[PDB]
Amino acid sequence: SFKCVNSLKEDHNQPLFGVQFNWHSKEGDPLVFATVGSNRVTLYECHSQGEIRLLQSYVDADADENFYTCAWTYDSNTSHPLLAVAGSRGIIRIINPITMQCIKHYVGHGNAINELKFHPRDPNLLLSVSKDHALRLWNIQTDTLVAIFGGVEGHRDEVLSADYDLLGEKIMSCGMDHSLKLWRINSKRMMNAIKESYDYNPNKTNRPFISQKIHFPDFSTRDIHRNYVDCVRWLGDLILSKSCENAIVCWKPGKMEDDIDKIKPSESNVTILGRFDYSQCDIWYMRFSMDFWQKMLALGNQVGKLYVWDLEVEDPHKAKCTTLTHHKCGAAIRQTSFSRDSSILIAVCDDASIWRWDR
């Protein structure tokens, strides 16, 4: 299946905390991915014979910035790919990946940003999750903060991950308080707030843009993991999430037969559909990724082993596991990313190394 065809290491020797292929690449352009670590983001092109061609980095003016995360979208007018980055300074930067110019930046969290995700249908809706316990939804077309997901009934410690579902109607977040929380964004209130965000132009009005303050998740559980929950992804109506306890759990809110859209905020049950165990992944901030079609799931561990689960089976617990090791790959893997066509898998490590695996 996958063979390791190349690796390299970036000059800073600090952890690479994230990697993302650009799935908005144009037809016939080469496959491109971004790595984030130290105070930089770097872009690379994949070519034949395993070649990983260095392009150009964005390096923050602050030597104390530490980028943790990035996410791709495109300009909704021009179609050109854009790259969002954020980390310990709690500043989101929107980067033109061609020139690596910082086009604009957003401050709110003031506090470390642990993850960024873009809405699956609307390239302007960017979600950030913070060390300050909140999530925020931004509209990067009109430069507005649409809503803050917080309150004492929100997370009570750093939020580490979040994911929108397929249509972008709800978000599942998770973090250091051991919980997973659901926030619906297709409520009348949230749909109106999005609509109003698009109508906002500070040059044609006197008002500040009002953000929603969302203080009540639509569902919450602490019954999946018993430690920091550091990665979550929807799989249709089910959830995949992990902690630092050497398992990915496949679960859903409520009882086995309960529709996700009839779950009420007081729902006190969850249903466990399976659990994928693996070894030596006790440190936290270790993210799995899926391929475009959500046929598979890849995770690295803290000693440089990859696990890949084939989810193309009739029930989540029947997933088929493949492992990939290389004798020289021994550092902690923080994140993986598949190319859009699934032909390439990249893993990035705590020693600033980058590993390329082709089918």
Binding site: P15, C244, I283, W284, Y285
Partner: peptide, 6 residues
């Protein structure tokens, strides 16, 4: 639990 191996 730590973030990075010691």
């Amino acid at each position: 639990h730590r973030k990075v191996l010691r």
